[PDB]
Amino acid sequence: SAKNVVLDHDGNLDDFVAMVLLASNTEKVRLIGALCTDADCFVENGFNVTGKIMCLMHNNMNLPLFPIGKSAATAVNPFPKEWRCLAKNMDDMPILNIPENVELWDKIKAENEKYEGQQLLADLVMNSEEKVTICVTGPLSNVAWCIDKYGEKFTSKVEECVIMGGAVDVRGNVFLPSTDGTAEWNIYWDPASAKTVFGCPGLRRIMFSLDSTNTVPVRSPYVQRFGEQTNFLLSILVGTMWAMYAADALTAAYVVDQKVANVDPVPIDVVVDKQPNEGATVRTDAENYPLTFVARNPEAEFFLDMLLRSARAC
């Protein structure tokens, strides 16, 4: 009885580890689509790696092909105009360039580049028979777009929106000359969109802010364990990426199984003014403000084992 899931990411290492986690857990998750945003990665690269991972898996296990869209979303505050995306690097990974798999990608490529990510997310959620879980591991610009365009017609079709982003009771990670460091990148990239989502009633939001994601670090001894499963392509793929925080992986791990963490209802608002704390997710005492279920104290061992086992799907 797998549930419909859509992955809304921005093509980074953990975004792809998160993709693998959703896709390899066929018993609990039916991945019906994915979209890429040109934030923490050049969309072109993020799009290609998404296709390459889907095909590698499609040809080795039970994984139906799904549509992949590039989002026309634009940044309000762009990521480090230096180093970020490793999507280009991954694009050259040998495990993702096996001829039979790239051949499939070349063949089904044209169909996908015809979609516009934002509209695709809307159509996958709204045309679905059963509800869909949106796993957002990049900015919230796309979920807000759908909300602003289709309102309740869109949200009522959402099972729940599992989000990686924010910093509630801990410091953020956006450290620029104009920021005080209380905000987190995914939110800071487009504060306005984040406000729309976090303030939209009728939408169940699971929030994986830095409060929870900072508790699951990437440690060498764990990563080395993938060397024990080199007979599985996914172990070579995941081990390699991590050899290079597991925020997005944790977020996707929850969609796979709730036991990853307990949630705590908190009224979340977003700072949109052009101040040092722009993009910070704060608490609001506004009367009956929609509550967001903030993830806390993640079962780290449960997650790490989930990932190790999942990398054995193929």
Binding partner of residue 89 among ligand AD3, its own copies, Ca ion, none, CB cut-off 5 to 8 Å per kind: its own copies
Q: Does 14 sit near ligand AD3 (CB under 6 A)?
A: yes
Angle of the 141-155 helix axis to the 191-199 helix axis, nearest 10: 20
Contacting range for ligand AD3; rule: CB under 6 A; set: 154-162, 180-188, 257-265, 269-277: 180-188
* Residue 159: strand, helix, or coil: strand
DSSP annotation of 180 reads: -
Among 93, 126, 272, 308, binds its own copies (CB under 8 A): 93
Distance of alpha carbon 142 from alpha carbon 145, whole angstroms: 5
Distance of alpha carbon 142 from alpha carbon 194, whole angstroms: 10
**Whole-number CA gyration radius for the chain:** 18
- As beta bridge partners, residue 132 has 4, 158
Shortest Å distance, C-beta 128 to ligand AD3: 25
The residues near 110 (Cβ < 8 Å, ≥ 6 apart) are none
Distance of alpha carbon 15 from alpha carbon 248, whole angstroms: 6
Helix (H) or strand (E) run with residue 44 in it: helix 43-58
* Helices of type H across the chain: 13-24, 43-58, 87-90, 99-112, 117-126, 141-155, 185-188, 191-199, 210-213, 220-224, 233-243, 247-256, 300-310
Q: Does 211 sit near ligand AD3 (CB under 6 A)?
A: no
Question: Binding-site residue total for Ca ion (CB under 5 A)?
Answer: 6
Q: Does 12 sit near Ca ion (CB under 5 A)?
A: yes
DSSP annotation of 290 reads: P
Q: Given the complex with its own copies, which of 90 and 253 has the nearer CB atom?
A: 90
Among 40, 160, 190, 278, binds ligand AD3 (CB under 6 A): 40
Maximum Cα interatomic distance, the chain, rounded to a whole number of Å: 58
Binding partner of residue 98 among ligand AD3, its own copies, Ca ion, none, CB cut-off 5 to 8 Å per kind: its own copies
Shortest Å distance, C-beta 13 to its own copies: 11
Q: Does 223 sit near its own copies (CB under 8 A)?
A: yes
Residues 49-68 that bind its own copies (CB under 8 A): none
Contacting range for its own copies; rule: CB under 8 A; set: 158-166, 179-187, 188-196, 241-249: 241-249
Encoded tokens for 60: 């080795």
Binding partner of residue 184 among ligand AD3, Ca ion, its own copies, none, CB cut-off 5 to 8 Å per kind: ligand AD3
By CB under 8 A, name the binding residues for its own copies. Answer: 89-99, 102, 220, 223-230, 235-236, 239-240, 242-244
By CB under 6 A, name the binding residues for ligand AD3. Answer: 12, 14-15, 40, 83, 137-138, 164, 173, 184-186, 247-248
By CB under 5 A, name the binding residues for Ca ion. Answer: 10, 12, 15, 137-138, 248
